[PDB]
Amino acid sequence: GSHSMRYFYTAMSRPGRGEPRFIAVGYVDDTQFVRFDSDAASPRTEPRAPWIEQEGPEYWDRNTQIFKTNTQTYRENLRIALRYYNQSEAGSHIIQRMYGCDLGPDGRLLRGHDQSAYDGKDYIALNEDLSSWTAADTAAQITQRKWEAARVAEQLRAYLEGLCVEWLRRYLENGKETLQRADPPKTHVTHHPVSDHEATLRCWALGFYPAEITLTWQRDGEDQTQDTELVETRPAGDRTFQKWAAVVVPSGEEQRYTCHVQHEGLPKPLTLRWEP
Amino acid sequence: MIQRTPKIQVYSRHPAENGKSNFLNCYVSGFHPSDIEVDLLKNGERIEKVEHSDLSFSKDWSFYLLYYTEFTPTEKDEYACRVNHVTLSQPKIVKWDRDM
Amino acid sequence: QASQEVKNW
Protein backbone atom coordinates (compact mmCIF):
# COMPACT_ATOMS: atom_id res chain seq x y z
CA GLY A 1 0.00 0.00 0.00
CA SER A 2 0.93 3.62 0.66
CA HIS A 3 3.70 4.43 3.12
CA SER A 4 5.04 7.39 5.07
CA MET A 5 8.08 8.48 7.05
CA ARG A 6 7.70 11.06 9.80
CA TYR A 7 9.91 12.66 12.39
CA PHE A 8 8.33 14.17 15.51
CA TYR A 9 10.25 16.68 17.60
CA THR A 10 9.20 17.98 21.04
CA ALA A 11 11.18 20.70 22.86
CA MET A 12 9.95 21.54 26.40
CA SER A 13 11.27 24.33 28.63
CA ARG A 14 11.24 23.96 32.38
CA PRO A 15 12.50 27.08 34.19
CA GLY A 16 14.39 26.25 37.35
CA ARG A 17 14.88 22.62 36.24
CA GLY A 18 17.64 22.95 33.59
CA GLU A 19 17.69 23.63 29.90
CA PRO A 20 14.76 22.56 27.74
CA ARG A 21 14.44 18.84 27.00
CA PHE A 22 14.51 17.89 23.29
CA ILE A 23 13.05 14.52 22.16
CA ALA A 24 13.01 13.27 18.56
CA VAL A 25 11.30 10.10 17.33
CA GLY A 26 11.23 8.69 13.81
CA TYR A 27 8.46 6.50 12.35
CA VAL A 28 7.78 4.52 9.21
CA ASP A 29 3.96 4.25 9.06
CA ASP A 30 2.94 3.17 12.62
CA THR A 31 6.40 1.67 13.45
CA GLN A 32 8.85 3.72 15.50
CA PHE A 33 12.45 3.12 14.47
CA VAL A 34 14.72 5.74 16.18
CA ARG A 35 14.62 7.94 19.26
CA PHE A 36 16.85 10.69 20.65
CA ASP A 37 16.38 12.20 24.14
CA SER A 38 18.54 15.06 25.40
CA ASP A 39 17.86 13.90 29.06
CA ALA A 40 19.40 10.46 28.43
CA ALA A 41 22.54 9.58 30.39
CA SER A 42 24.35 9.55 27.00
CA PRO A 43 22.15 11.30 24.41
CA ARG A 44 22.46 9.62 21.04
CA THR A 45 20.21 8.27 18.29
CA GLU A 46 18.99 4.87 19.51
CA PRO A 47 17.43 2.04 17.36
CA ARG A 48 13.75 1.20 18.14
CA ALA A 49 13.16 -1.31 15.29
CA PRO A 50 15.29 -4.40 14.34
CA TRP A 51 15.67 -3.44 10.64
CA ILE A 52 17.47 -0.15 11.47
CA GLU A 53 20.20 -1.86 13.48
CA GLN A 54 22.20 -2.74 10.30
CA GLU A 55 22.89 0.90 9.54
CA GLY A 56 26.59 1.70 9.84
CA PRO A 57 28.33 4.09 12.21
CA GLU A 58 28.21 6.91 9.67
CA TYR A 59 24.42 6.72 9.98
CA TRP A 60 24.23 6.94 13.76
CA ASP A 61 26.77 9.75 13.82
CA ARG A 62 25.03 11.88 11.18
CA ASN A 63 21.66 11.59 12.90
CA THR A 64 23.08 12.09 16.40
CA GLN A 65 24.86 15.26 15.25
CA ILE A 66 21.61 16.52 13.72
CA PHE A 67 19.66 15.88 16.92
CA LYS A 68 22.34 17.45 19.14
CA THR A 69 22.34 20.51 16.90
CA ASN A 70 18.53 20.59 16.92
CA THR A 71 18.59 20.50 20.74
CA GLN A 72 20.47 23.82 20.69
CA THR A 73 18.36 25.29 17.86
CA TYR A 74 15.02 24.55 19.56
CA ARG A 75 16.29 25.93 22.90
CA GLU A 76 16.96 29.15 21.03
CA ASN A 77 13.55 28.87 19.29
CA LEU A 78 11.85 28.61 22.71
CA ARG A 79 13.64 31.81 23.82
CA ILE A 80 12.61 33.56 20.57
CA ALA A 81 8.98 32.47 21.05
CA LEU A 82 8.84 34.13 24.46
CA ARG A 83 9.81 37.39 22.79
CA TYR A 84 7.29 36.92 19.94
CA TYR A 85 4.41 36.42 22.46
CA ASN A 86 5.56 38.88 25.15
CA GLN A 87 5.86 36.01 27.63
CA SER A 88 7.79 35.76 30.89
CA GLU A 89 10.78 33.50 31.50
CA ALA A 90 8.95 31.87 34.43
CA GLY A 91 6.60 29.57 32.48
CA SER A 92 7.02 26.17 30.75
CA HIS A 93 6.35 26.11 26.98
CA ILE A 94 6.50 23.49 24.24
CA ILE A 95 7.54 23.57 20.59
CA GLN A 96 6.49 20.59 18.46
CA ARG A 97 7.35 19.77 14.86
CA MET A 98 6.32 16.94 12.51
CA TYR A 99 7.91 16.51 9.06
CA GLY A 100 8.29 13.82 6.45
CA CYS A 101 7.15 12.32 3.20
CA ASP A 102 4.25 10.25 1.92
CA LEU A 103 4.55 7.71 -0.89
CA GLY A 104 1.66 6.49 -3.03
CA PRO A 105 1.13 2.83 -3.92
CA ASP A 106 3.42 3.17 -6.94
CA GLY A 107 6.15 4.40 -4.60
CA ARG A 108 6.47 7.97 -5.83
CA LEU A 109 6.32 11.08 -3.65
CA LEU A 110 2.71 11.87 -2.98
CA ARG A 111 3.28 14.82 -0.71
CA GLY A 112 5.68 16.33 1.81
CA HIS A 113 5.09 17.85 5.25
CA ASP A 114 6.83 20.22 7.71
CA GLN A 115 4.52 21.66 10.30
CA SER A 116 5.25 23.22 13.68
CA ALA A 117 3.30 24.23 16.80
CA TYR A 118 3.83 26.36 19.92
CA ASP A 119 2.01 25.36 23.13
CA GLY A 120 -0.04 22.83 21.18
CA LYS A 121 -1.41 25.39 18.70
CA ASP A 122 -0.51 25.54 15.04
CA TYR A 123 2.38 27.98 14.45
CA ILE A 124 3.65 27.58 10.87
CA ALA A 125 3.39 24.97 8.14
CA LEU A 126 5.14 24.30 4.84
CA ASN A 127 2.49 24.39 2.11
CA GLU A 128 1.86 21.41 -0.17
CA ASP A 129 3.82 23.13 -2.96
CA LEU A 130 6.97 22.78 -0.75
CA SER A 131 7.71 26.41 -1.71
CA SER A 132 5.60 28.68 0.52
CA TRP A 133 4.41 28.86 4.14
CA THR A 134 1.17 29.36 6.04
CA ALA A 135 1.68 31.25 9.33
CA ALA A 136 -0.98 31.01 11.98
CA ASP A 137 -0.52 34.42 13.64
CA THR A 138 1.56 37.56 13.55
CA ALA A 139 4.43 35.93 15.52
CA ALA A 140 4.72 33.15 12.99
CA GLN A 141 4.70 35.73 10.16
CA ILE A 142 8.02 36.96 11.58
CA THR A 143 9.41 33.44 11.28
CA GLN A 144 7.86 33.19 7.80
CA ARG A 145 9.73 36.32 6.66
CA LYS A 146 13.02 34.89 8.00
CA TRP A 147 12.50 31.61 6.23
CA GLU A 148 11.52 33.31 2.99
CA ALA A 149 14.64 35.44 3.20
CA ALA A 150 16.81 32.31 3.76
CA ARG A 151 14.97 30.16 1.17
CA VAL A 152 14.39 27.46 3.79
CA ALA A 153 11.53 25.98 1.77
CA GLU A 154 13.93 25.21 -1.12
CA GLN A 155 16.18 23.21 1.19
CA LEU A 156 13.24 21.33 2.73
CA ARG A 157 11.86 20.58 -0.73
CA ALA A 158 15.21 19.06 -1.68
CA TYR A 159 15.13 16.88 1.45
CA LEU A 160 11.47 15.83 1.06
CA GLU A 161 11.80 14.87 -2.65
CA GLY A 162 15.28 13.36 -2.27
CA LEU A 163 16.76 11.95 0.96
CA CYS A 164 13.36 11.43 2.63
CA VAL A 165 11.91 9.36 -0.23
CA GLU A 166 15.16 7.51 -0.91
CA TRP A 167 15.66 6.46 2.69
CA LEU A 168 11.95 5.60 3.19
CA ARG A 169 12.23 3.21 0.23
CA ARG A 170 15.42 1.77 1.75
CA TYR A 171 13.75 1.17 5.14
CA LEU A 172 10.70 -0.37 3.46
CA GLU A 173 13.01 -2.87 1.70
CA ASN A 174 15.14 -3.65 4.74
CA GLY A 175 12.04 -4.03 6.85
CA LYS A 176 9.84 -5.62 4.25
CA GLU A 177 8.82 -8.59 6.46
CA THR A 178 7.06 -6.21 8.86
CA LEU A 179 6.71 -2.78 7.27
CA GLN A 180 5.18 -4.24 4.11
CA ARG A 181 2.97 -6.78 5.92
CA ALA A 182 -0.54 -5.83 6.84
CA ASP A 183 -2.08 -7.89 9.62
CA PRO A 184 -5.91 -7.93 9.30
CA PRO A 185 -8.13 -7.53 12.34
CA LYS A 186 -9.49 -10.52 14.18
CA THR A 187 -13.14 -9.55 14.61
CA HIS A 188 -16.08 -10.61 16.81
CA VAL A 189 -19.28 -9.16 18.36
CA THR A 190 -20.03 -9.42 22.07
CA HIS A 191 -23.41 -8.89 23.70
CA HIS A 192 -24.01 -7.28 27.10
CA PRO A 193 -27.54 -6.65 28.45
CA VAL A 194 -27.95 -3.18 29.97
CA SER A 195 -31.51 -3.86 31.20
CA ASP A 196 -34.38 -6.20 30.53
CA HIS A 197 -35.15 -4.40 27.24
CA GLU A 198 -31.77 -3.15 25.87
CA ALA A 199 -28.34 -4.67 25.27
CA THR A 200 -24.95 -3.42 24.13
CA LEU A 201 -23.45 -4.92 21.02
CA ARG A 202 -19.69 -4.35 20.87
CA CYS A 203 -17.83 -4.97 17.64
CA TRP A 204 -14.16 -5.75 18.33
CA ALA A 205 -11.13 -5.55 16.03
CA LEU A 206 -7.91 -6.96 17.46
CA GLY A 207 -4.36 -7.69 16.37
CA PHE A 208 -4.26 -5.42 13.33
CA TYR A 209 -1.50 -3.43 11.61
CA PRO A 210 -1.36 -0.67 10.46
CA ALA A 211 -3.57 1.34 12.80
CA GLU A 212 -5.94 2.82 10.14
CA ILE A 213 -9.29 1.01 10.34
CA THR A 214 -12.98 1.78 9.92
CA LEU A 215 -15.54 0.16 12.25
CA THR A 216 -19.18 1.03 11.79
CA TRP A 217 -22.60 -0.20 12.91
CA GLN A 218 -25.66 -0.31 10.65
CA ARG A 219 -29.28 -0.78 11.75
CA ASP A 220 -31.48 -2.06 8.92
CA GLY A 221 -28.58 -1.10 6.67
CA GLU A 222 -28.35 2.54 7.79
CA ASP A 223 -25.22 3.89 9.45
CA GLN A 224 -25.58 4.55 13.17
CA THR A 225 -22.82 7.19 13.48
CA GLN A 226 -24.61 9.45 16.03
CA ASP A 227 -25.64 6.47 18.26
CA THR A 228 -22.26 4.63 18.06
CA GLU A 229 -19.66 4.70 20.86
CA LEU A 230 -16.25 4.44 19.15
CA VAL A 231 -13.08 4.17 21.28
CA GLU A 232 -9.76 5.58 20.10
CA THR A 233 -7.59 3.01 18.36
CA ARG A 234 -5.06 1.83 20.92
CA PRO A 235 -1.74 -0.03 20.86
CA ALA A 236 -1.62 -3.59 22.12
CA GLY A 237 2.14 -3.43 22.79
CA ASP A 238 3.19 -6.08 20.19
CA ARG A 239 3.08 -3.59 17.23
CA THR A 240 -0.60 -4.24 16.61
CA PHE A 241 -3.67 -2.17 17.48
CA GLN A 242 -7.15 -2.63 18.92
CA LYS A 243 -10.48 -0.85 18.52
CA TRP A 244 -14.15 -1.37 19.27
CA ALA A 245 -17.48 0.21 18.36
CA ALA A 246 -20.62 -0.22 20.46
CA VAL A 247 -24.36 0.40 20.06
CA VAL A 248 -27.21 0.01 22.54
CA VAL A 249 -30.04 -1.90 20.88
CA PRO A 250 -33.54 -3.04 21.87
CA SER A 251 -33.66 -6.60 23.10
CA GLY A 252 -34.99 -8.79 20.33
CA GLU A 253 -33.69 -6.49 17.59
CA GLU A 254 -30.06 -7.67 17.66
CA GLN A 255 -30.15 -9.24 14.21
CA ARG A 256 -31.11 -5.91 12.61
CA TYR A 257 -27.60 -4.69 13.39
CA THR A 258 -24.46 -5.36 11.38
CA CYS A 259 -20.88 -4.32 12.03
CA HIS A 260 -18.74 -3.34 9.02
CA VAL A 261 -14.91 -3.54 9.11
CA GLN A 262 -12.55 -1.97 6.58
CA HIS A 263 -8.80 -2.55 6.86
CA GLU A 264 -5.88 -2.68 4.40
CA GLY A 265 -5.24 -6.32 5.39
CA LEU A 266 -8.76 -7.39 4.33
CA PRO A 267 -9.26 -8.38 0.64
CA LYS A 268 -12.93 -7.25 1.01
CA PRO A 269 -14.81 -5.21 3.68
CA LEU A 270 -16.17 -7.58 6.38
CA THR A 271 -19.78 -7.69 7.68
CA LEU A 272 -20.43 -9.39 11.06
CA ARG A 273 -23.32 -9.77 13.51
CA TRP A 274 -23.99 -11.07 16.97
CA GLU A 275 -23.92 -14.89 16.84
CA PRO A 276 -25.77 -16.28 19.90
CA MET B 1 -2.24 28.43 28.14
CA ILE B 2 -4.90 26.13 26.57
CA GLN B 3 -4.57 22.69 28.25
CA ARG B 4 -6.10 19.29 27.30
CA THR B 5 -6.95 16.56 29.81
CA PRO B 6 -5.87 12.95 29.20
CA LYS B 7 -8.08 10.21 27.86
CA ILE B 8 -7.43 6.89 29.60
CA GLN B 9 -7.96 3.30 28.46
CA VAL B 10 -7.03 0.30 30.61
CA TYR B 11 -6.93 -3.07 28.87
CA SER B 12 -4.85 -6.18 28.24
CA ARG B 13 -2.66 -7.08 25.26
CA HIS B 14 -4.42 -10.44 24.77
CA PRO B 15 -7.93 -11.52 25.87
CA ALA B 16 -7.88 -12.01 29.63
CA GLU B 17 -7.54 -15.66 30.73
CA ASN B 18 -7.08 -16.29 34.46
CA GLY B 19 -3.73 -17.91 35.24
CA LYS B 20 -2.21 -17.03 31.85
CA SER B 21 0.58 -14.46 31.71
CA ASN B 22 -0.46 -11.30 29.85
CA PHE B 23 0.28 -7.58 29.65
CA LEU B 24 -1.67 -4.86 31.40
CA ASN B 25 -1.81 -1.57 29.43
CA CYS B 26 -2.73 1.97 30.43
CA TYR B 27 -2.98 4.15 27.30
CA VAL B 28 -3.10 7.87 27.96
CA SER B 29 -3.72 10.20 25.08
CA GLY B 30 -5.14 13.52 24.01
CA PHE B 31 -3.31 15.51 26.65
CA HIS B 32 -1.32 18.76 26.63
CA PRO B 33 1.15 19.71 28.08
CA SER B 34 3.29 16.59 28.15
CA ASP B 35 4.16 16.15 31.85
CA ILE B 36 2.06 13.32 33.23
CA GLU B 37 2.23 10.81 36.07
CA VAL B 38 0.90 7.31 35.52
CA ASP B 39 0.93 4.36 37.92
CA LEU B 40 -0.48 0.90 37.43
CA LEU B 41 -2.17 -0.51 40.56
CA LYS B 42 -2.55 -4.12 41.70
CA ASN B 43 -5.17 -4.19 44.47
CA GLY B 44 -4.51 -0.53 45.23
CA GLU B 45 -0.74 -0.83 45.29
CA ARG B 46 1.69 0.66 42.81
CA ILE B 47 3.41 -1.87 40.59
CA GLU B 48 7.12 -1.22 40.49
CA LYS B 49 8.02 -2.80 37.16
CA VAL B 50 6.30 -0.47 34.63
CA GLU B 51 7.76 0.59 31.28
CA HIS B 52 6.45 3.18 28.86
CA SER B 53 6.76 4.19 25.23
CA ASP B 54 8.72 7.20 23.88
CA LEU B 55 6.85 10.49 23.85
CA SER B 56 5.09 11.29 20.62
CA PHE B 57 2.00 13.09 19.63
CA SER B 58 -1.00 13.02 17.33
CA LYS B 59 -1.81 15.27 14.38
CA ASP B 60 -3.67 17.63 16.72
CA TRP B 61 -0.41 18.00 18.76
CA SER B 62 -1.82 16.15 21.80
CA PHE B 63 0.54 13.65 23.40
CA TYR B 64 0.15 9.96 23.95
CA LEU B 65 1.99 7.27 25.90
CA LEU B 66 1.54 3.56 26.62
CA TYR B 67 2.41 2.34 30.13
CA TYR B 68 2.65 -1.46 30.38
CA THR B 69 3.53 -4.27 32.82
CA GLU B 70 3.54 -8.10 32.52
CA PHE B 71 0.73 -9.51 34.73
CA THR B 72 -0.94 -12.90 35.41
CA PRO B 73 -4.74 -12.16 35.67
CA THR B 74 -6.95 -13.89 38.27
CA GLU B 75 -10.59 -13.62 39.28
CA LYS B 76 -9.89 -11.80 42.55
CA ASP B 77 -6.98 -9.44 41.74
CA GLU B 78 -8.10 -5.96 40.70
CA TYR B 79 -6.07 -3.72 38.43
CA ALA B 80 -6.31 -0.03 37.72
CA CYS B 81 -4.45 2.91 36.22
CA ARG B 82 -3.90 6.13 38.21
CA VAL B 83 -3.19 9.30 36.22
CA ASN B 84 -2.16 12.75 37.34
CA HIS B 85 -1.98 15.78 35.05
CA VAL B 86 -2.11 19.54 35.49
CA THR B 87 -5.71 19.54 34.20
CA LEU B 88 -6.84 17.31 37.10
CA SER B 89 -7.78 18.55 40.56
CA GLN B 90 -7.07 15.05 41.87
CA PRO B 91 -5.62 11.90 40.31
CA LYS B 92 -8.02 9.96 38.14
CA ILE B 93 -8.31 6.21 38.67
CA VAL B 94 -9.66 3.99 35.91
CA LYS B 95 -10.34 0.36 36.81
CA TRP B 96 -9.45 -2.44 34.43
CA ASP B 97 -12.66 -3.92 32.96
CA ARG B 98 -11.79 -7.04 30.97
CA ASP B 99 -14.74 -6.40 28.59
CA MET B 100 -13.57 -2.97 27.41
CA GLN C 1 17.17 9.82 7.77
CA ALA C 2 16.61 13.14 9.65
CA SER C 3 16.64 16.53 7.84
CA GLN C 4 19.77 18.63 8.40
CA GLU C 5 18.15 21.97 7.51
CA VAL C 6 18.22 24.51 10.36
CA LYS C 7 14.84 26.02 11.30
CA ASN C 8 15.67 29.24 13.20
CA TRP C 9 12.39 30.85 14.46
Author numbering:
A (entry chain A): 1 to 276
B (entry chain B): 0 to 99
C (entry chain C): 1 to 9
Paper text:
One such highly networked epitope associated with control is QW9 (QASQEVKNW, HIV-1 p24gag residues 176-184). QW9 can be presented by the disease-protective HLA-B*5701 (hereafter B57), but also by the typically disease-neutral HLA-B*5301 (hereafter B53). Here we examine the CTL response to QW9, a highly networked epitope presented by the disease-protective HLA-B57 and disease-neutral HLA-B53. To explore the molecular underpinnings of differential cross-recognition of QW9 and QW9_S3T restricted by the two HLAs, we next determined the crystal structures of QW9-B53, QW9_S3T-B53, QW9-B57 and QW9_S3T-B57.
As the electron density maps show, every individual side chain of QW9 is well-defined in the high-resolution structures for analyses. In QW9-B53, E5QW9 is oriented inward by HLA residue R97B53 through S3QW9 and a water-mediated hydrogen-bond network. Despite HLA sequence differences within the binding groove and differences in TCR recognition, the structures of QW9-B57 and QW9-B53 can be superimposed remarkably well. Particularly notable is the fact that sidechains of exposed QW9 residues Q1QW9, Q4QW9, V6QW9, and N8QW9 are very well defined by electron density maps and adopt the same conformation in both apo and complex structures. We show that CTLs derived from B53-expressing (B53+) and B57-expressing (B57+) infected persons at a time of viremic control readily recognize the QW9 peptide.
